[PDB]
Design a protein around this ligand. Structure first.
Ligand code: ZN
Lengths: 132, 132, 149, 44, 189, 95, 102
RNA sequence: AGCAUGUCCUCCGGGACGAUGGGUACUCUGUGGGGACCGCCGGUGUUAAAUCGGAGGAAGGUGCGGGCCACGGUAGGUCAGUAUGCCCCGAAUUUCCCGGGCUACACGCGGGCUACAAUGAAUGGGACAAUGGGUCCCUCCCCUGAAAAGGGCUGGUAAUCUCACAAACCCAUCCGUAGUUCGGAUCGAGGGCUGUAACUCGCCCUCGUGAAGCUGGAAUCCGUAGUAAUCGCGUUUCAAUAUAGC
């Protein structure tokens, strides 16, 4: 009985089906997960608990691929600095790159670094009655 | 021969050009057959005076409708008043007029008018803002 | 008459969608699996036959609503746009989706080019009347008092 | 005639609260005063 | 002619007799083809005396904030609750509803009268129109409370409320509120 | 380190470096420039001591290294220039 | 068939209807094929303003509703007839518009 | 709305077309008029002024909602819409741009916008509303993209034309059971048009983090019929931005 399943060290909702099981993992939410379901050739509406492990392995490989079944205008890391290309992370790497991109700015005394280090809004909306 | 009246009391807006005639019995209620009348959920509200007239009457009768606009419920009762007036305009009895006035008029003017011209000082016509 | 209006819109639109599925000239072009129904909704469609049913619905809309421009089609194909804590405007549809569907419709010959949109071609009107006769054949026994009596 | 408040209303030299609506170009107080002299009337 | 009108084309209100004899002259069993009469409660008061009761029960079901302007969904819930009451509790369903109204309508109520030199509300008889209104209000409250935050539908909880207040089921919210108000009236006789 | 390694960034083209930058900077540079930033570019391409006075300007590829001075309500402040800040706004550093 | 169209939309409709009757009597004198006086929709131009000048003051708005009474009439074309129509004493309260469609 | 045409159904009137010929047959029509005065009748009040159902009647007895609202005070606000007394400033408190600021925020408070069901996420279905804008500005159709949008080109001095789809809705239905597809504030890359300039300080768009939270005590608040409530709509603050006023 496949009441709960694990993929790439991140035990997702084994009860939940394919279309929403990948939203729980970081890096994919809603829209880009159904692209993975399209690429892996599995109907999302089928229960994951009644899915034998071979198809789950194909789904894991397809989600590991990801970028070959996703368009170029739906990536979270388009034009990523010295890399230049468009990427899409997964795991702790998004928060890691975010925190390094904030603390290097804080060392360089950029405004967004100060607004991040002080716990203030960076988009500039009025701080009169927010986060009390 | 043919009856053309759109006066119905004008629930908000009605736009019900009546067209009632006499033929073989083929009745097309506003380019729609009565057997598969397209509104469906609102035809129960609209088929009251025709039901009171009788199957033999409207089977003898022949009716068409020309429309411009109006809200859905304003349509659903103004068109019913128009159909009642078209029923009484064709050579008929006053017993149908008595039955039509018996249930809830449907030959009169809607006494509750369109709106009330909300005044500055509040959101609605009578409502106002919240005083502490 | 075997007009479309003697039948419910659901059965006729599904019949038109099936006939367009039988025709190879209508296809889901490339970006059907990564773009939504427009700009209003949240996610792309979940139904399998969304493109063919959308083309059939656009055909039925052009028939019952005359010649319609692409921006009129976008306005018809809007939705309750979620903004979070904003007053929920209804914006538009999608230009490229509606335009590709309309180009498929005219390549199929059902839609006819006109100045104020594209009115439905006469051949599409005749074939949809015949399909209405088919679906009305499914309920020809409802009212026998319709042929010449 | 394209700006935030650069254009001023007639008579009252002012750069805020001017009725540029209807090509009137009057402040709200000034237009309120002179609407009854310029043909306007509070009919309702 | 009157073509034997039934509620939603299914339940004729002619073949139903009222139990609460006072409420018979106020709750109306008049046949109407659709429960959207759109009443006229401004020419006088108690304009509902000639209006249908299924419409009234459907428009007292819009107690909730989102329910305003939603008579269509109220009629949907009314119809599916009528189906449930007819199925699980096979009987004339409007008869079951009128039994529920006559059973959960507050017979007695307490009203402030400053007699005897004390701030004390006195226990008084309740009007038939007022009692019918409070019965419909408590039915709506029970339906809304069961239907909120629940796996059971709105119309299902309405059917549960009607069965509770119709067959004298003591678990229904309407019965408990009517008994509570009557107890408070007994406390201040 | 924007689009490439940091060495060749100074010698990149104006529009290529703009494409390295986001849409806001690209449109800011796309619809021409006023006289002040043209003067700033000219003096940077000369090499004299420069007080920019503009808090919204975009750092240029070869403009880096030399120090920029910005009016901050109170008179002026001198701020260093690094590869991290290229393409940014001048007023992001002296609030 | 040729018609000369008349477009008027103004503030005082009494003199407007008087000019309409004057043109109608001119047409009946000259035997010009005429279209009857057609009441067009009236432009109910509205612009409100808050009454209170100073800071404190509750809701006080004087609404400036103005009706612009439109009228469209069609008559035939003729040189002596058009000169007669152009020499009519029409009041200043309306604007006279002509379209010589032939 | 018949008269007749331009294409299909053939079961046969016609369905579609009011562009038109035509007909303003019946209507919406906007300028002048009538209507419903407690008038008659049955109660009350006195036989007065005034008061209930009877009326087959659009409103029976302020038909229904609104503007104007006196003698005076409240030394209430208005030198910051306007003019003006005196004290003052008369090279600054005059006067023209640049940058910042009024957005800065341990923070108290006022009013608004969103939220937890089968009364809910996708897909269709039907035509739906008016007020009021637009010619120096909304946008017709065509092409391009996923979006915002770009080019071209059409309609409008506006019962022509366009912003213009209304949403809420409802249904073959699809849709699922739990405080989560019901529920979305922050922040990271990205593309936009508006402007002379977008970091402070904008909105649009797309993606990934989907959180806080789960009908809210004391206290209060609005409201009597197409009104509360609700769902969205133009317009004003015009370069955008309205969770706002109207
Ligand atoms: Zn002025």
């Amino acid at each position: 009985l496949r009441h709960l399943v694990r993929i790439m060290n991140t035990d997702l909702q084994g009860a939940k089906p394919v279309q929403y099981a990948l939203t729980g993992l970081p890096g994919v939410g809603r829209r880009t997960a159904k692209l993975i379901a399209k690429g892996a050739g599995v109907d999302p509406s089928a229960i994951l608990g009644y899915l034998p492990e071979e198809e789950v392995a194909k789904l894991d490989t397809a989600i590991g691929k990801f970028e070959d079944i996703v368009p170029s205008w739906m990536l979270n890391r388009q034009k990523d600095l010295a890399t230049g290309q468009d990427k899409h992370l997964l795991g702790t790497d998004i928060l890691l790159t975010f925190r390094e991109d904030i603390n290097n700015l804080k060392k360089v005394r950029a405004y967004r670094g100060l607004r991040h280090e002080r716990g203030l809004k960076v988009r500039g909306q009025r701080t009169k009655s927010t986060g009390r | 021969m043919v009856k053309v009246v759109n006066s119905s009391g004008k629930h908000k807006t009605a736009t019900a050009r009546a067209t009632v005639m006499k033929g073989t019995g083929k009745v097309r209620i506003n380019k729609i057959p009565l057997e598969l009348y397209t509104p469906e959920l609102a035809m129960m509200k609209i088929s009251e005076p025709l039901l009171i007239a009788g199957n033999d009457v409207v089977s003898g009768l022949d009716i068409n409708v020309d429309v411009r606009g109006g809200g859905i419920i304003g349509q659903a009762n103004a068109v019913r008043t128009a159909v009642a007036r078209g029923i009484v305009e064709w050579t008929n009895d006053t017993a149908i007029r008595d039955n039509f006035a018996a249930y809830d008029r449907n030959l009169l003017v809607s006494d509750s008018r369109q709106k009330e011209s909300k005044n500055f000082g509040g959101p609605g016509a009578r409502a106002k803002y919240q005083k502490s | 008459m075997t007009t479309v209006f003697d039948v419910p819109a659901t059965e006729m639109i599904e019949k038109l969608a099936g006939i367009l599925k039988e025709d190879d000239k209508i296809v889901p072009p490339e970006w059907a699996g990564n773009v939504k129904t427009g700009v209003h909704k949240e996610l792309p469609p979940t139904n399998d036959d969304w493109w063919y049913i959308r083309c059939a619905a656009v055909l039925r809309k052009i028939y019952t609503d005359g010649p319609i421009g692409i921006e009129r089609l976008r306005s018809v194909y809007g939705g309750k746009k979620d903004n979070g804590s904003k007053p929920f405007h209804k914006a538009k549809g999608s230009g490229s989706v509606a335009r590709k569907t309309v180009q498929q419709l005219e390549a199929a010959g059902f839609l006819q080019k006109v100045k104020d949109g594209r009115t439905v071609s006469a051949k599409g009107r005749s074939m949809m009347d015949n399909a209405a006769h088919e679906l009305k054949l499914e309920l020809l026994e409802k009212i026998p008092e319709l042929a010449k009596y | 005639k394209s700006g935030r408040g650069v254009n001023e209303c007639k008579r009252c030299g002012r750069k805020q609260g001017l009725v540029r609506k209807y090509d009137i170009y009057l402040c709200r107080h000034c237009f309120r005063e002179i609407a009854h002299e310029m043909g306007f009337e509070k009919y309702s | 002619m009157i073509f034997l009108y039934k509620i939603f084309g299914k339940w004729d209100p002619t073949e139903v007799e009222v139990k609460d004899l006072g409420i018979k002259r106020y709750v109306s069993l008049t046949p109407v083809i659709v429960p959207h009469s759109s009443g006229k409660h401004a020419r006088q008061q108690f304009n509902k005396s000639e209006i249908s009761i299924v419409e009234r029960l459907a428009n007292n079901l819009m107690r909730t904030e989102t329910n305003t302007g939603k008579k269509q969904v109220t009629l949907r819930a009314v119809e599916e609750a009528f189906d449930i009451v007819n199925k699980k509790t096979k009987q004339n369903p409007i008869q079951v509803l009128v039994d529920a109204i006559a059973n959960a309508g507050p017979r007695e109520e307490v009203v402030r009268l400053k007699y005897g030199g004390i701030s004390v509300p006195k226990a008084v008889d309740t009007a038939p129109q007022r009692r019918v209104d409070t019965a419909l209000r408590y039915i709506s409250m029970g339906t809304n409370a069961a239907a909120f935050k629940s796996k059971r539908s709105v119309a299902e909880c309405l059917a549960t409320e009607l069965i509770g207040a119709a067959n004298r089921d003591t678990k229904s919210f309407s019965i408990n509120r009517k008994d509570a108000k009557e107890r408070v009236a007994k406390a201040a006789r | 380190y924007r689009g490439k390694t940091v060495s060749e960034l100074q010698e990149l083209s104006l529009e290529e470096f703009a494409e390295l930058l986001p849409s806001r900077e690209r449109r800011s540079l796309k619809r021409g420039f006023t006289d002040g930033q043209k003067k700033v570019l000219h003096e940077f391409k000369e090499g004299k001591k420069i007080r920019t006075h503009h808090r919204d300007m975009i750092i240029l590829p070869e403009m880096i290294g030399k120090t920029i001075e910005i009016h901050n309500g109170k008179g002026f402040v001198s701020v260093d220039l690094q590869p991290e800040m290229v393409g940014h706004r001048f007023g992001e550093f002296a609030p | 068939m040729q018609k000369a169209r008349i477009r008027l939309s103004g503030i005082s409709p009494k003199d407007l209807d008087g000019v309409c009757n004057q043109v109608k009597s001119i047409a009946e004198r000259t035997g010009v094929n005429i279209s009857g006086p057609v009441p067009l929709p009236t432009k109910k131009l509205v612009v409100p303003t808050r009454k209170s000048p100073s800071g404190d003051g509750t809701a006080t708005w004087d609404h400036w509703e103005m009706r612009v009474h439109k009228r469209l009439i069609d008559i035939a074309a003729d040189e002596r007839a058009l000169r007669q129509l152009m020499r009519i004493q029409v009041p200043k309260d309306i604007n006279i518009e002509i379209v010589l469609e032939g």
